[PDB]
Design an enzyme around this catalytic site. Sequence first.
Site, PDB file in Angstrom:
ATOM      1  CB  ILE A 177      -0.979   0.000   1.179  1.00  0.00           C
ATOM      2  CG1 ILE A 177      -0.300   0.088   2.551  1.00  0.00           C
ATOM      3  CG2 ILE A 177      -1.903  -1.184   1.058  1.00  0.00           C
ATOM      4  CD1 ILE A 177      -1.300   0.233   3.709  1.00  0.00           C
ATOM      5  N   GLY A 178       2.167   1.128   0.218  1.00  0.00           N
ATOM      6  CA  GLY A 178       3.031   2.328   0.159  1.00  0.00           C
ATOM      7  C   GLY A 178       4.490   1.975   0.079  1.00  0.00           C
ATOM      8  N   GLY A 199       7.303   4.196   1.502  1.00  0.00           N
ATOM      9  CA  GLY A 199       7.737   5.360   2.296  1.00  0.00           C
ATOM     10  C   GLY A 199       9.212   5.668   2.090  1.00  0.00           C
ATOM     11  N   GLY A 200       9.746   6.561   2.925  1.00  0.00           N
ATOM     12  CA  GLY A 200      11.150   7.004   2.904  1.00  0.00           C
ATOM     13  C   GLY A 200      12.106   5.825   2.956  1.00  0.00           C
ATOM     14  N   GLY A 211      11.362   2.298   3.668  1.00  0.00           N
ATOM     15  CA  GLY A 211      10.814   0.926   3.643  1.00  0.00           C
ATOM     16  C   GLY A 211       9.535   0.857   2.850  1.00  0.00           C
ATOM     17  CB  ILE A 253       3.458   0.451   4.517  1.00  0.00           C
ATOM     18  CG1 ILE A 253       2.323   0.162   5.499  1.00  0.00           C
ATOM     19  CG2 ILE A 253       3.034   1.409   3.471  1.00  0.00           C
ATOM     20  CD1 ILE A 253       1.979   1.338   6.361  1.00  0.00           C
ATOM     21  CG  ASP A 279       9.194  12.740   7.930  1.00  0.00           C
ATOM     22  OD1 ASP A 279       9.498  13.449   6.962  1.00  0.00           O
ATOM     23  OD2 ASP A 279       8.793  11.451   7.829  1.00  0.00           O
TER      24      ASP A 279
HETATM   25 CL1  LIG Z   1       3.658   7.132   0.413  1.00  0.00          CL
HETATM   26  C1  LIG Z   1       2.278   8.179   0.272  1.00  0.00           C
HETATM   27  C2  LIG Z   1       2.459   9.502  -0.083  1.00  0.00           C
HETATM   28  C3  LIG Z   1       1.356  10.329  -0.201  1.00  0.00           C
HETATM   29  C4  LIG Z   1       0.090   9.845   0.056  1.00  0.00           C
HETATM   30  C5  LIG Z   1      -0.099   8.519   0.399  1.00  0.00           C
HETATM   31  C6  LIG Z   1       1.001   7.676   0.503  1.00  0.00           C
HETATM   32  O1  LIG Z   1       0.837   6.330   0.768  1.00  0.00           O
HETATM   33  C7  LIG Z   1       0.762   5.905   2.088  1.00  0.00           C
HETATM   34  C8  LIG Z   1       0.303   4.628   2.339  1.00  0.00           C
HETATM   35  C9  LIG Z   1       0.252   4.157   3.639  1.00  0.00           C
HETATM   36  C10 LIG Z   1       0.699   4.947   4.691  1.00  0.00           C
HETATM   37  N1  LIG Z   1       0.641   4.473   6.011  1.00  0.00           N
HETATM   38  C11 LIG Z   1      -0.403   3.877   6.643  1.00  0.00           C
HETATM   39  N2  LIG Z   1      -1.576   3.746   5.984  1.00  0.00           N
HETATM   40  C12 LIG Z   1      -2.560   3.100   6.621  1.00  0.00           C
HETATM   41  N3  LIG Z   1      -2.548   2.560   7.840  1.00  0.00           N
HETATM   42  C13 LIG Z   1      -1.368   2.725   8.482  1.00  0.00           C
HETATM   43  N4  LIG Z   1      -1.091   2.340   9.762  1.00  0.00           N
HETATM   44  C14 LIG Z   1       0.183   2.765  10.072  1.00  0.00           C
HETATM   45  C15 LIG Z   1       0.739   3.398   9.004  1.00  0.00           C
HETATM   46  C16 LIG Z   1      -0.237   3.371   7.963  1.00  0.00           C
HETATM   47  C17 LIG Z   1       1.178   6.224   4.427  1.00  0.00           C
HETATM   48  C18 LIG Z   1       1.195   6.711   3.132  1.00  0.00           C
END
Ligand SMILES: Clc1ccccc1Oc1ccc(Nc2ncnc3[nH]ccc23)cc1
Length: 294
Positions: A22-23, A25-26, A28, A30, A136
Amino acid sequence: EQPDILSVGILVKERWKVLRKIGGGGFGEIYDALDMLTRENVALKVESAQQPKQVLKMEVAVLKKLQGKDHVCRFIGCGRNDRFNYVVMQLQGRNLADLRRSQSRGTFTISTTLRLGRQILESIESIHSVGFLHRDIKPSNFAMGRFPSTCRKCYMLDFGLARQFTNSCGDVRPPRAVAGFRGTVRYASINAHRNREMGRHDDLWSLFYMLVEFVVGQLPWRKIKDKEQVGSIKERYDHRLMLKHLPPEFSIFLDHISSLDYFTKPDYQLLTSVFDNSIKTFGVIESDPFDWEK
Ligand SMILES: Clc1ccccc1Oc1ccc(Nc2ncnc3[nH]ccc23)cc1
């Protein structure tokens, strides 16, 4: 390019079934996982055991210290192996960065801005209160909950770039002469730009930049890519110009955070009063639809 750190379908510790990335990040990735003990969807953060900068040890420390507090995900588990390190925590909903970008002009109303702002300030005072700086603060580190009972609650999602700023007693630690900033140029304070040791006030500068971007839709340094050009703008910028589209009491907010330095504890009650007073003046009530509902 490189594959995902985890293959979708694998089981982590005979418990967490990886469903989807689902992501990224910087430092790692997720994933949405199924927790086969509780039979619920959870968030699973991972990092390579070999990557040069690993932050999940900080993620776990801060998440644990904040259990019981508002605006934080429930801690579910963590581990380290030869391939990867991981942390498991409560899965949340729509990310503030995405919600803002879905708005007509990338703006939120003052109603949505004040309520989110006050929740985010609560989350900052909370992490400071257990001795950590966030360092951050930016919209993509916040999301609304994903259930009827949580979707009006904003959660601080990540603590990777945090630093402990106190002793056990609450003594502020001597700052380093140089501190190499690794956060986001757009919302970074001047101190981050100058590679100075960040303090509690630098998290409140980043909140001020987020609030201005919520109401105006952009920051003055939106189109500037060069970090040292952005910093030069911020160093000279008259931040009173950003008061134009905020409620009048934000002059108090800005004067207060302008007065702070690394060694000066914020007046959190003063800053909270700016939000409380503004919310009453604008007749905002908690049950009013957020912009994305209506
Ligand atoms: Cl990387 C990014 C940039 C901009 C807009 C969204 C993005 O994607 C995510 C996807 C997931 C997360 N984190 C989470 N999501 C959902 N539940 C979560 N529990 C803990 C963390 C977490 C953060 C950004």
